[PDB]
CSV table of C-alpha atoms and ligand atoms in Angstrom, one decimal:
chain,number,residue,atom,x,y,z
A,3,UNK,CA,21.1,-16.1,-2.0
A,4,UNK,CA,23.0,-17.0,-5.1
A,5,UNK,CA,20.3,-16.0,-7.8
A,6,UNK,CA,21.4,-13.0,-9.9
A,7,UNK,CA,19.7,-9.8,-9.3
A,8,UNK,CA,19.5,-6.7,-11.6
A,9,UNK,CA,17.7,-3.6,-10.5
A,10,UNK,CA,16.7,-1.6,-13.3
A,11,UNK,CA,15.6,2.2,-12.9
A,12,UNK,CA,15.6,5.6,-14.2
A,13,UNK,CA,18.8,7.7,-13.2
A,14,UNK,CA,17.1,9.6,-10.6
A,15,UNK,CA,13.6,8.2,-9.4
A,16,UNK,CA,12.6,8.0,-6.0
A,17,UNK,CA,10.9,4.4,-6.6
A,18,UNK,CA,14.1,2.7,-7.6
A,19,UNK,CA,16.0,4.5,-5.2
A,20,UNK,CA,13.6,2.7,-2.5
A,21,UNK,CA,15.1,-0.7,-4.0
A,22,UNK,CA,18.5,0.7,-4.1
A,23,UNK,CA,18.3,0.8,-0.2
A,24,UNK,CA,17.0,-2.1,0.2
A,25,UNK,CA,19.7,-4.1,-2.4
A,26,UNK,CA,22.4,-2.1,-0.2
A,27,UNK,CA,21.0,-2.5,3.5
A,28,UNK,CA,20.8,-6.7,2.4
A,29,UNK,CA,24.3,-6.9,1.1
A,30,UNK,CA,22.7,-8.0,-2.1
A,31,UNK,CA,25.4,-8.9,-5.2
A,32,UNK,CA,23.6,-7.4,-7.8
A,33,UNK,CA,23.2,-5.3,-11.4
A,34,UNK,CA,22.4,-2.1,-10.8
A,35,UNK,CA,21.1,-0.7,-14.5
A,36,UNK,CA,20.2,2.8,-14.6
A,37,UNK,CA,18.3,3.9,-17.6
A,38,UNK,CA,17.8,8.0,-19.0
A,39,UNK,CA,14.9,10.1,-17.9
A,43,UNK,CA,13.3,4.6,-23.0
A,44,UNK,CA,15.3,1.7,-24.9
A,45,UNK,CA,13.8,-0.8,-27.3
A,46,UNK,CA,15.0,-3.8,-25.4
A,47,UNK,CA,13.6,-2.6,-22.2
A,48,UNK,CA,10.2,-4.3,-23.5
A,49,UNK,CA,12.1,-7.6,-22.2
A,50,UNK,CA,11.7,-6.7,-18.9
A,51,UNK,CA,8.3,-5.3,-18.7
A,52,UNK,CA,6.0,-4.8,-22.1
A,53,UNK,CA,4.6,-1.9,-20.4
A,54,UNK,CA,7.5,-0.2,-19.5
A,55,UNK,CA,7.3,0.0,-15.8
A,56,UNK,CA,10.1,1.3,-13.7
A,57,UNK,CA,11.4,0.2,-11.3
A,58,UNK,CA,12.0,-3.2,-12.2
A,59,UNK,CA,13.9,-6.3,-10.9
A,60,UNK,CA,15.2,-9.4,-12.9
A,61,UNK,CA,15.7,-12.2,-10.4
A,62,UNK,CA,17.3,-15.4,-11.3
A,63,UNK,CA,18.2,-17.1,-14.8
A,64,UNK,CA,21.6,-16.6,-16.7
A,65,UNK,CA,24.2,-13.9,-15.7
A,66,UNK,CA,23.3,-11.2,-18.1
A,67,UNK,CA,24.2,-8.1,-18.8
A,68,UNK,CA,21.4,-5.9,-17.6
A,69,UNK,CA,20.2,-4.3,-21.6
A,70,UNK,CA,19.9,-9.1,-22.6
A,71,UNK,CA,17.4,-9.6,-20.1
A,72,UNK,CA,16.9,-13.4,-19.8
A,73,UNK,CA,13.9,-15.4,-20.9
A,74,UNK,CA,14.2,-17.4,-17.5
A,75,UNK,CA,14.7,-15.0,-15.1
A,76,UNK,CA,11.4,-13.7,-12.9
A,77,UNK,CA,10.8,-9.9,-14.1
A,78,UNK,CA,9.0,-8.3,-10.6
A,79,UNK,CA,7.8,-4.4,-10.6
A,80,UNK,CA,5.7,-2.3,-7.8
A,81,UNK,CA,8.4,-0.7,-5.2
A,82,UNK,CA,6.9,-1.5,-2.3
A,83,UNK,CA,6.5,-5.3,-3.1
A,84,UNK,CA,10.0,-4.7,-4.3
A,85,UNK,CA,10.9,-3.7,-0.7
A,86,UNK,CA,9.4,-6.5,0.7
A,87,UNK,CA,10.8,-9.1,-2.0
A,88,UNK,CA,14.9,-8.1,-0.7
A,89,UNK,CA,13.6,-9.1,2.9
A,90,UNK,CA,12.5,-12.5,2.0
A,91,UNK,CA,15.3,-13.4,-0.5
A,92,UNK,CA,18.0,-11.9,2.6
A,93,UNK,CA,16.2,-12.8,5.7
A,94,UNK,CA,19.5,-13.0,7.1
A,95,UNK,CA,19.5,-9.1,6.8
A,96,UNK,CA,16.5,-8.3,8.8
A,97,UNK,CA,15.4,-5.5,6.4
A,98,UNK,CA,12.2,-5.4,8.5
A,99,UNK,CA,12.2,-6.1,12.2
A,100,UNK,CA,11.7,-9.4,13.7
A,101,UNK,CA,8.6,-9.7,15.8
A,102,UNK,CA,5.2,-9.3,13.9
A,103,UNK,CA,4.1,-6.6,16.1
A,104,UNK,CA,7.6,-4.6,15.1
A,105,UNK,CA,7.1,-5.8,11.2
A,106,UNK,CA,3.1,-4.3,11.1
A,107,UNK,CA,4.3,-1.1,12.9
A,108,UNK,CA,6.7,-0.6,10.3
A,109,UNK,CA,4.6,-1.4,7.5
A,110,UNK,CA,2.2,1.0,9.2
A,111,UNK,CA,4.0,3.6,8.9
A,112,UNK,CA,4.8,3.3,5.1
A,113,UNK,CA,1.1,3.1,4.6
A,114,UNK,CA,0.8,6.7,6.9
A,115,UNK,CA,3.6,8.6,3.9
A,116,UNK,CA,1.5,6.7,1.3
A,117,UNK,CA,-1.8,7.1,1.8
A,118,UNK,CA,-1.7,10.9,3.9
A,119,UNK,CA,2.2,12.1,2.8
A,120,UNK,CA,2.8,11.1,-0.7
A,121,UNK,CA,0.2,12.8,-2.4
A,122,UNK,CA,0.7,16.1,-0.7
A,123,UNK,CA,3.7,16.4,-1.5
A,124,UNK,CA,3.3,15.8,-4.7
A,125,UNK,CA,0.1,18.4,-4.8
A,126,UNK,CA,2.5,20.9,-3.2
A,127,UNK,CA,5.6,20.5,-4.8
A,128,UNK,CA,4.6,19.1,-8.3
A,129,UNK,CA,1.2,20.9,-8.9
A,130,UNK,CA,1.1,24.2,-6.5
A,131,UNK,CA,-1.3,23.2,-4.8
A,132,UNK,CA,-2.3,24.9,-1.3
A,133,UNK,CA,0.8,23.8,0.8
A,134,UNK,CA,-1.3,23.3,4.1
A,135,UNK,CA,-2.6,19.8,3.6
A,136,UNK,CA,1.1,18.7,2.9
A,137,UNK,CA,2.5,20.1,6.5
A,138,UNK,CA,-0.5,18.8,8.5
A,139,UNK,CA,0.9,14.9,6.2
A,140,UNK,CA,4.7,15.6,7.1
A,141,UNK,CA,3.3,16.3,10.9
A,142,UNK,CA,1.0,12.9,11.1
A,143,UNK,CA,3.7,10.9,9.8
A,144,UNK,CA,6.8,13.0,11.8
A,145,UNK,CA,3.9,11.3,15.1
A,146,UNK,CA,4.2,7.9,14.2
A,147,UNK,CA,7.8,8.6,14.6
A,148,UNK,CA,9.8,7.2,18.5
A,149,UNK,CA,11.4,10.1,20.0
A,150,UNK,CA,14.5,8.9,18.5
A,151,UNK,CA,16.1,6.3,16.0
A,152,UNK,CA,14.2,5.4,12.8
A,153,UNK,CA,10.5,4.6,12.3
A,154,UNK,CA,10.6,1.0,14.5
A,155,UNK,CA,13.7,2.0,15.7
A,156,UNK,CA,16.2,0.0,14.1
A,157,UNK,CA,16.3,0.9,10.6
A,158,UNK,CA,14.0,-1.1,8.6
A,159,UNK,CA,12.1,-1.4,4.6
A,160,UNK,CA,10.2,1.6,6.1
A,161,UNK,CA,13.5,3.9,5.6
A,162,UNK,CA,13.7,2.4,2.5
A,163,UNK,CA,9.9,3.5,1.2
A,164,UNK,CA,10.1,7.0,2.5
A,165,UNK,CA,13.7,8.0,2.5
A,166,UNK,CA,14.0,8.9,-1.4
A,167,UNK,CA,11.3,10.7,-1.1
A,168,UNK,CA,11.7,13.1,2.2
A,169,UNK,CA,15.0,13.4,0.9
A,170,UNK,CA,14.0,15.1,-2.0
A,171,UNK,CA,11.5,17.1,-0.5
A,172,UNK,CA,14.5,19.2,2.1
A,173,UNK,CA,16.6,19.3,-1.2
A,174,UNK,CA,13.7,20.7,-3.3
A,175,UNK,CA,12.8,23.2,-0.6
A,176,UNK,CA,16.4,24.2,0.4
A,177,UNK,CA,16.7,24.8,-3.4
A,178,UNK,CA,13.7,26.6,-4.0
A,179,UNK,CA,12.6,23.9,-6.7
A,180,UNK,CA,8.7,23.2,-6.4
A,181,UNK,CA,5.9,24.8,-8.4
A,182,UNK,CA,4.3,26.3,-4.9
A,183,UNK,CA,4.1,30.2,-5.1
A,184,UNK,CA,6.8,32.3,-3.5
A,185,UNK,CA,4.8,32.7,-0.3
A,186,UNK,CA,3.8,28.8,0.1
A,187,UNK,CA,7.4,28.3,-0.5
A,188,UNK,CA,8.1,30.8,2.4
A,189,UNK,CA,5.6,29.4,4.7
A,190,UNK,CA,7.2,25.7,4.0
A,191,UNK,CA,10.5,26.9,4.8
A,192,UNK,CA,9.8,28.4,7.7
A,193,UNK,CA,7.7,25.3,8.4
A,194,UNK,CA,10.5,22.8,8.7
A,195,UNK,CA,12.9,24.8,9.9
A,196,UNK,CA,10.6,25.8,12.9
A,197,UNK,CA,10.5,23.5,16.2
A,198,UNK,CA,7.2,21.5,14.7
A,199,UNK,CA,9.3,20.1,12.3
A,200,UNK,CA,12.6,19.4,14.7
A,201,UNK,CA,11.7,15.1,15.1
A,202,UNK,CA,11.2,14.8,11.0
A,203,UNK,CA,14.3,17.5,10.7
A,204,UNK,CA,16.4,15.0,12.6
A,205,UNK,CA,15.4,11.8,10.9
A,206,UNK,CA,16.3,13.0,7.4
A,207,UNK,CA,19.5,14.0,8.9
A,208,UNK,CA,19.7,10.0,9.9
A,209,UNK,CA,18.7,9.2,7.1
A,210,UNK,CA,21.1,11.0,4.8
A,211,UNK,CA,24.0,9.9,7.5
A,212,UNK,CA,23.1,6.1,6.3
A,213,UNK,CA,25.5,4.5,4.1
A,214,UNK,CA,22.7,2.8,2.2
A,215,UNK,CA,21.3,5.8,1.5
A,216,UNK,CA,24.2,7.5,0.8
A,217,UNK,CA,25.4,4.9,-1.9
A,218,UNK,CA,22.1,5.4,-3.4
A,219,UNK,CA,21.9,9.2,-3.1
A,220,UNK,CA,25.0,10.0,-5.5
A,221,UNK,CA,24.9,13.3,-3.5
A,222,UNK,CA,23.5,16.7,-3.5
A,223,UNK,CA,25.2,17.9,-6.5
A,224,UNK,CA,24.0,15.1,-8.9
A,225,UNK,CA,20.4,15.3,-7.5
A,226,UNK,CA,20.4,18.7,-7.4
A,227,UNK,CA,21.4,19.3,-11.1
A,228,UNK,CA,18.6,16.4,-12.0
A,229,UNK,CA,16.3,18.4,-9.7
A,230,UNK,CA,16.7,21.7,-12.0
A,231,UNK,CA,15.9,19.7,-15.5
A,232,UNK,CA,12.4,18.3,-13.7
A,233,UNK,CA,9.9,20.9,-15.4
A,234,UNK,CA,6.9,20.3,-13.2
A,235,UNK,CA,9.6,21.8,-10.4
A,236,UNK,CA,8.9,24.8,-12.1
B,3,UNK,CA,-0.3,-18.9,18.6
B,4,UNK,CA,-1.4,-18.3,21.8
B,5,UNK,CA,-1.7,-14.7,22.6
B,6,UNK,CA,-5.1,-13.9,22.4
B,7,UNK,CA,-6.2,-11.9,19.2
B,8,UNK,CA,-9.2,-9.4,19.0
B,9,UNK,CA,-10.0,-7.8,16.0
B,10,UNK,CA,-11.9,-4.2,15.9
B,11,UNK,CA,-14.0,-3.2,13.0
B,12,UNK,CA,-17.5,-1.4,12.0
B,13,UNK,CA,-19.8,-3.8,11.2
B,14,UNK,CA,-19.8,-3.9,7.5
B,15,UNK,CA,-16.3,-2.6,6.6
B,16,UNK,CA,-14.7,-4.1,3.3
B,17,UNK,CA,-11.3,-2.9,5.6
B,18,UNK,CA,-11.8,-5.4,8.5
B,19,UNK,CA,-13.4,-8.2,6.4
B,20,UNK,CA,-10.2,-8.3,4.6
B,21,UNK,CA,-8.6,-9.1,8.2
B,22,UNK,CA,-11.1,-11.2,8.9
B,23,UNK,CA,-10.7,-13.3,6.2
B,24,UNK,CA,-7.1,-13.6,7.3
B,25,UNK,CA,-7.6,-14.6,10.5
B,26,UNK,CA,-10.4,-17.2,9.1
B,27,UNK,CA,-7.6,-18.9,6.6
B,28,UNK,CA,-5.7,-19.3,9.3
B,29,UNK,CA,-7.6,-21.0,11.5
B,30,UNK,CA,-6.9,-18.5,14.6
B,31,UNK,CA,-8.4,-18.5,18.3
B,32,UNK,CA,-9.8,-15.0,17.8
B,33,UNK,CA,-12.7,-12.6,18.9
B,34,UNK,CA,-14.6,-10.2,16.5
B,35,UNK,CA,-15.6,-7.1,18.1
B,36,UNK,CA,-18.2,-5.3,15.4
B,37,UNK,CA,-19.1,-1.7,16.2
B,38,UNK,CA,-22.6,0.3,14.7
B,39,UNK,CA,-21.0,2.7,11.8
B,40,UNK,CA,-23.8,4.8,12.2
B,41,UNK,CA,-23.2,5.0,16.1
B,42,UNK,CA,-20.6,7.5,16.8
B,43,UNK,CA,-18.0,5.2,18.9
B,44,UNK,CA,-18.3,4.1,22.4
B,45,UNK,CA,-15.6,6.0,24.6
B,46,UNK,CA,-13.7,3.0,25.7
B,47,UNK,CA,-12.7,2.9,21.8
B,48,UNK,CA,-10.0,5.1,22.4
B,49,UNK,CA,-8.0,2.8,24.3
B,50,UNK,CA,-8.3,0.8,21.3
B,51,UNK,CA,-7.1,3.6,18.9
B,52,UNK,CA,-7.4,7.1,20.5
B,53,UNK,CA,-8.2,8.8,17.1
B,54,UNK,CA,-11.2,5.9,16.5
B,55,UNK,CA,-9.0,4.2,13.7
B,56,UNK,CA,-10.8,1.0,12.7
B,57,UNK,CA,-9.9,-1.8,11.7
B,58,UNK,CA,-8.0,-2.5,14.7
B,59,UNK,CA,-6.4,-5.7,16.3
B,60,UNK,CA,-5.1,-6.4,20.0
B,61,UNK,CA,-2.5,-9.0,20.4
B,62,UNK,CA,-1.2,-10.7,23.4
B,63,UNK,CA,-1.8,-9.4,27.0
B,64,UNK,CA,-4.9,-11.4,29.7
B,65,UNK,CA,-8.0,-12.5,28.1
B,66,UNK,CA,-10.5,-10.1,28.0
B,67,UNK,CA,-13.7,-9.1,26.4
B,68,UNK,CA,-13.6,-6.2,23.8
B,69,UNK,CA,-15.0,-3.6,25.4
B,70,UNK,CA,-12.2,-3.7,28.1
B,71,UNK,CA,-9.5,-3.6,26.4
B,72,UNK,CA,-6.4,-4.0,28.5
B,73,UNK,CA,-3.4,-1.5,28.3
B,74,UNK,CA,-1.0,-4.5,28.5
B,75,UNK,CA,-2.3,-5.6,24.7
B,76,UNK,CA,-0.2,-4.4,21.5
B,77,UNK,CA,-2.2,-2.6,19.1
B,78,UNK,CA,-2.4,-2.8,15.4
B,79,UNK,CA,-4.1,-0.9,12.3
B,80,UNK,CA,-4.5,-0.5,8.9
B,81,UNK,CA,-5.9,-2.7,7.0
B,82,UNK,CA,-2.9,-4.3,4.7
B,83,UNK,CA,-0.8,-4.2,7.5
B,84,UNK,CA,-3.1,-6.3,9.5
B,85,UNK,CA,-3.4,-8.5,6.7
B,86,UNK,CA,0.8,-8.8,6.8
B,87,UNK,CA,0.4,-9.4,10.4
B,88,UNK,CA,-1.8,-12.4,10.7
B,89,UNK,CA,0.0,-13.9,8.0
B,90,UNK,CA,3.7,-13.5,10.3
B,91,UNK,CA,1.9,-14.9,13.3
B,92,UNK,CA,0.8,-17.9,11.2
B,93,UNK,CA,3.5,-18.8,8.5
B,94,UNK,CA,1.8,-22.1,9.2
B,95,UNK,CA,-1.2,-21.0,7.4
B,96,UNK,CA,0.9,-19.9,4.0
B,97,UNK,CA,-1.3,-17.1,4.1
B,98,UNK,CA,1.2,-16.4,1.4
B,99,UNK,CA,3.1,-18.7,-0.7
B,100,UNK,CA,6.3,-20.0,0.3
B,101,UNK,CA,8.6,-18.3,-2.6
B,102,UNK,CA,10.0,-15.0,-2.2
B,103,UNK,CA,8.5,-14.2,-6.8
B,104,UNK,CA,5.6,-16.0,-5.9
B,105,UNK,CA,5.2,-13.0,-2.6
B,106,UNK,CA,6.2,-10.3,-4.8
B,107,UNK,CA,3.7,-11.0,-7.0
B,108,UNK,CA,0.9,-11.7,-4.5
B,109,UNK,CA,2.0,-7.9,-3.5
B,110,UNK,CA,2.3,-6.3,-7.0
B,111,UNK,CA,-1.6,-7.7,-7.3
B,112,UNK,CA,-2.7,-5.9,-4.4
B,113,UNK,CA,-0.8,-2.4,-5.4
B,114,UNK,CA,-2.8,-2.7,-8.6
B,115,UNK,CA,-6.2,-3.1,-7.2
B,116,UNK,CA,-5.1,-0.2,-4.7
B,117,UNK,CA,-3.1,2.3,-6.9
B,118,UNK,CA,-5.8,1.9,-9.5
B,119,UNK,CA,-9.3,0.6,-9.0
B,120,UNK,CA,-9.5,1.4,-5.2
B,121,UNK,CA,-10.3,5.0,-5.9
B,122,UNK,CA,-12.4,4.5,-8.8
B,123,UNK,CA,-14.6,2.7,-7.0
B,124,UNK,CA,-14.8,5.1,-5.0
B,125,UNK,CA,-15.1,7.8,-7.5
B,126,UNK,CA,-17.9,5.5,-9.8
B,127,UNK,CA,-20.0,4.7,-6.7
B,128,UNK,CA,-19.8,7.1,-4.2
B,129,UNK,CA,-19.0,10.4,-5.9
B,130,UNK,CA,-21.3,9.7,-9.3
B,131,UNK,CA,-17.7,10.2,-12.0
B,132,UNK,CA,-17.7,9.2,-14.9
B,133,UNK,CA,-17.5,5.5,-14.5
B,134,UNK,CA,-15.0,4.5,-18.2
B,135,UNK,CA,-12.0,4.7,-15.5
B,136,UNK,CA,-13.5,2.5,-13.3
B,137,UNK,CA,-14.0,-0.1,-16.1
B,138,UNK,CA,-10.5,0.3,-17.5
B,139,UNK,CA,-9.2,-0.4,-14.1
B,140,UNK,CA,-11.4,-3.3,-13.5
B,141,UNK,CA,-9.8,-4.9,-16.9
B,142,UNK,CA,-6.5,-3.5,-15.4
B,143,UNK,CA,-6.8,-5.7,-12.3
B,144,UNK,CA,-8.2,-8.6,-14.2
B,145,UNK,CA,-5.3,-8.4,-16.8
B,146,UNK,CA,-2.9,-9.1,-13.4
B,147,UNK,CA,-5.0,-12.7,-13.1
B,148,UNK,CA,-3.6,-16.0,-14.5
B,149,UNK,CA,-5.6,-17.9,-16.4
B,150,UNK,CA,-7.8,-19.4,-13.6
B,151,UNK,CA,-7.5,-20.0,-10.1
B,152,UNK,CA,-6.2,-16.5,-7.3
B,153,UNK,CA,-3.9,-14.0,-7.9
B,154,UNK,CA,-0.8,-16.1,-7.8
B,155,UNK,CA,-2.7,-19.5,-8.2
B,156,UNK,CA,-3.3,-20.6,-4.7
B,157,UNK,CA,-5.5,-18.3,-2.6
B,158,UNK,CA,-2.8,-15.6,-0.9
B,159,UNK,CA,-3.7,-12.4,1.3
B,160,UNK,CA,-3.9,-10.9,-2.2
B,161,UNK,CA,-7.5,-11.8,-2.1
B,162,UNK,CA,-8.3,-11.1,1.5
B,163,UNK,CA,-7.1,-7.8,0.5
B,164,UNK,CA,-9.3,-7.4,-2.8
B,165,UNK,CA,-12.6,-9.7,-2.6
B,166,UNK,CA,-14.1,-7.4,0.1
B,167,UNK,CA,-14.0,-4.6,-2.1
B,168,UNK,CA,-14.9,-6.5,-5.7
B,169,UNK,CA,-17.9,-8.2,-3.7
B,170,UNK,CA,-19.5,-5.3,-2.7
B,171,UNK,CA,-18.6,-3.5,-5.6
B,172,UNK,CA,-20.5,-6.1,-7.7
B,173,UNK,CA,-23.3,-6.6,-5.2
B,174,UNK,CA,-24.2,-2.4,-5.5
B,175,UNK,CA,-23.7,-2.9,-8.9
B,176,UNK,CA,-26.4,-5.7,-9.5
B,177,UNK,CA,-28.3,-4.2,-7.5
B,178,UNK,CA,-28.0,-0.3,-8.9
B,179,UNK,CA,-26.6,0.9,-5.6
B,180,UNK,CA,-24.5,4.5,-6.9
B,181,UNK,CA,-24.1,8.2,-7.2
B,182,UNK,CA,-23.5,6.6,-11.1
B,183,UNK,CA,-26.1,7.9,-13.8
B,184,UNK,CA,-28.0,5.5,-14.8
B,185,UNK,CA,-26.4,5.2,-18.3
B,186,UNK,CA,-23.5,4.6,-17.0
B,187,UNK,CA,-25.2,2.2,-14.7
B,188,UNK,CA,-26.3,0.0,-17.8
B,189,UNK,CA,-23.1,0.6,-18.8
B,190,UNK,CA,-21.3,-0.9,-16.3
B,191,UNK,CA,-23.7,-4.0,-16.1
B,192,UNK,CA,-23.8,-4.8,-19.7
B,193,UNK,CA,-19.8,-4.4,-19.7
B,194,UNK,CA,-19.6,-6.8,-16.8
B,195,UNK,CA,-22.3,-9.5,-18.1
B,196,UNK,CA,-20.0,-9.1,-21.4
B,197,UNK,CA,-17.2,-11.0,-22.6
B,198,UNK,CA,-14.8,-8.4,-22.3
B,199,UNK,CA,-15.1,-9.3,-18.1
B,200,UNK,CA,-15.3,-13.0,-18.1
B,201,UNK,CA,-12.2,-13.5,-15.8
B,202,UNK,CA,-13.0,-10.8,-13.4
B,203,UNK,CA,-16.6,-12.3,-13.3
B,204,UNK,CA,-15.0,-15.7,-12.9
B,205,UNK,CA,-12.6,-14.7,-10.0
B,206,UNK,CA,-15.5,-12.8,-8.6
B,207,UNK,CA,-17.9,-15.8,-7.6
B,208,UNK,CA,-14.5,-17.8,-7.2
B,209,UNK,CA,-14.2,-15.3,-4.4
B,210,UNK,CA,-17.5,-15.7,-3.1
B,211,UNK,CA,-17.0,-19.7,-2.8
B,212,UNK,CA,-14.4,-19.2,-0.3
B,213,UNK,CA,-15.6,-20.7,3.0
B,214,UNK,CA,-13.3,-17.9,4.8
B,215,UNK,CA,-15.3,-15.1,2.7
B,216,UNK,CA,-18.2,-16.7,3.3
B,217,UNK,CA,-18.0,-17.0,6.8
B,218,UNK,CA,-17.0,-13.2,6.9
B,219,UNK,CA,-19.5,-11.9,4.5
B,220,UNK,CA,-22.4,-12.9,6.2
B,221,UNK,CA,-24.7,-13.1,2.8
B,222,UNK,CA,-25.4,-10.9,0.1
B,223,UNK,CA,-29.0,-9.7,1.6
B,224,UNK,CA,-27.2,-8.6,5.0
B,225,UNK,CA,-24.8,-6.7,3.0
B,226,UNK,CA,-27.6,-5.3,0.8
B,227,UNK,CA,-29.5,-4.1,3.8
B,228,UNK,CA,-26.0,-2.6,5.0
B,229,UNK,CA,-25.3,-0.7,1.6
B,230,UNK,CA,-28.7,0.8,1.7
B,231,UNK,CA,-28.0,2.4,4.7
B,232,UNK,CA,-24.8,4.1,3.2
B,233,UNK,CA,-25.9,7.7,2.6
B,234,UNK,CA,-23.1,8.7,0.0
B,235,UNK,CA,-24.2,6.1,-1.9
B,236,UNK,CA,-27.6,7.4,-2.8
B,237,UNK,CA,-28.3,9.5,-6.1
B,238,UNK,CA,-30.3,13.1,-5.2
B,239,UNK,CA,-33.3,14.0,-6.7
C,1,MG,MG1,-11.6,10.2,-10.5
C-alpha cells in the first residue's frame, strides 16, 4: 500500500494506541500526529472532534494541513479492522474465518462484559466485584498459552492498551476504588485466578508493537497521575 | 462453500436475524435451527454453546440435523462476529464492499448504532427512561446515512447488523409496545412521523423491502404477536 496514512490521537489514549499497534504490527509507513490532552484545524479531520482519527490517501501532508482528498475514518475498532484490509499481507487477524470470528469474539467479550467494568471500578469507584468476575470471563476465552487465537492478532490490538493500563493503574494505586477495593484487586491479580491474564499482559508488554506504542512506564505513569477521575 | 452451516437462535431474536440476513444475501446452503425463548433450552444445547449463548452457528463437520449437533463442527457466536463470519466465507457475496474506506465505514456505522442507540432502545422500551436520548441517538444514527440508498450506498452487513433492531423498534413503536409513558409515547411517534426523521423513516421501509429481511422477518403480525409475549416490555398498572 502506497497511500499515505496519518494516525491522529491524543498523547496518551488507549483508543489510538489500539491503531498504533495495528500501524506497527502491518509495517505501515505512516504519520503518527499526537495531539494534547484541541487545535482549530483539527475540525479538518473530523467536525466533531473525534479521536482517534485516520487520514488515508490524498497529498503528502503534514499531519496539522489535512487534505481535502484524503478519506478521514474514526471508530477504533473499525480502525483495527481497516490496517488488516489495506496490509493483508500482514495477517493482522488470522487466516481462516473460523480463526478471524474467534478473534473478533473475543474483542466483543472485553467490550461488551470487560470495558465497562473497568471503567466502573477504576474511573467511578464503583463495587470492584463485577470488574474481576469481566477480567475472569475474558482471561477463559483465553488458549492455555499464546495470545487470544494464538498468533497475535487485531484482538491484541483492541485490548492491549487497555489491560495495560489497568496492571499500571493498580500497581500504582491510581483508580478512584476505595482503599479496601483497591486491596482486594491487588490481591486479585496477583493471586493464581489471575496467573493466564497475568501472563498475557506480560506477552503483551514483551511485544515490540506494543512497546513502540507504550513509550514506557514512566511516560504513562506520569500521564496516569494528571488523569483526575484516577483520583 | 461447502461445509455445512447451521445457525442457532431463539425464535424472534433481532441477534440471529441479523445472521440470518447474512446468510440470506449470500445465497448460502444453510439450516435454521429456531428455539422457543420462553422454553428454558433443550439439554443438547449445550453442545452447541455450554453456557446457552444464542445466536450460534456450526460450520463444517457431517451433515446433521440440529438437535444433534456433532462434536466434529466448529462453533461460532456473537452476533457481529457472525455477521463478519459469513461475509469471510462468502467474499463472493460482497457482503461488504470491495474497498478497504468503503469497509471502515460500513463498520464505523455499525459502532454508532451500537455505542449509541443500542442501549437506548433498550433503556426507552424496556426499562420506561426517559426517551429524549433515544431520539437524539436515532438522529445520531441517521446523521451517519448518505443521502439515500444503505449505510455506505450498496447494502453491506451494516444493515444486517442494524435493520433487526430499527424494525422492531419501529414496529413496538407503531404499535405502543413499551415501558415508555405514554407522553413520551406520542412523543416519539409525532417525532418519527415528523420531518426532523424523514431519512431514518426512509431507510427504515428501505429496510423492510429487502427480500433477505423479508425472508427473515417473517411479517410484521408474527413479530407483533412475538413482542406481545415479551414481558419487560409491558407497562404495570
Ligand atoms: Mg439510559
Amino acid at each position: 500500500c502506497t497511500e499515505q496514512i496519518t494516525l491522529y490521537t491524543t498523547t496518551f489514549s488507549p483508543y489510538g494506541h489500539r491503531a498504533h499497534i495495528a500501524l506497527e504490527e502491518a509495517g505501515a509507513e505512516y504519520t503518527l500526529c499526537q495531539i494534547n490532552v484541541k487545535p482549530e484545524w483539527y475540525k479538518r479531520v473530523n467536525p466533531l472532534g473525534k479521536v482517534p482519527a485516520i487520514t488515508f490517501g490524498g497529498p503528502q501532508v503534514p499531519p496539522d494541513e489535512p487534505s481535502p482528498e484524503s478519506e478521514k475514518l474514526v471508530e477504533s475498532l473499525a480502525l483495527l479492522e481497516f490496517v488488516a484490509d489495506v496490509f493483508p499481507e500482514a495477517k493482522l487477524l488470522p487466516a481462516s474465518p473460523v480463526q478471524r470470528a474467534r478473534a473478533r469474539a473475543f474483542i466483543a467479550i472485553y467490550q461488551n462484559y470487560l470495558h465497562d467494568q473497568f471503567r466502573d471500578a477504576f474511573f467511578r469507584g464503583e463495587p470492584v466485584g463485577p470488574f474481576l468476575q469481566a477480567l475472569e470471563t475474558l482471561q477463559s476465552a483465553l488458549p492455555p498459552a499464546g495470545f487470544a487465537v494464538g498468533e497475535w492478532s487485531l484482538a491484541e490490538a483492541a485490548v492491549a492498551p487497555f489491560l495495560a493500563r489497568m496492571m499500571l493503574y493498580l500497581d500504582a494505586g491510581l483508580g478512584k476504588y476505595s482503599e479496601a477495593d483497591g486491596e482486594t484487586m491487588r490481591a486479585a491479580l496477583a493471586s493464581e485466578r489471575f496467573a493466564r491474564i497475568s501472563q498475557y499482559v506480560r506477552d503483551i508488554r514483551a511485544r515490540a508493537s506494543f512497546v513502540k506504542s507504550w513509550g514506557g512506564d514512566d511516560v504513562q505513569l506520569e500521564a496516569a497521575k494528571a488523569i483526575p477521575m484516577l483520583r
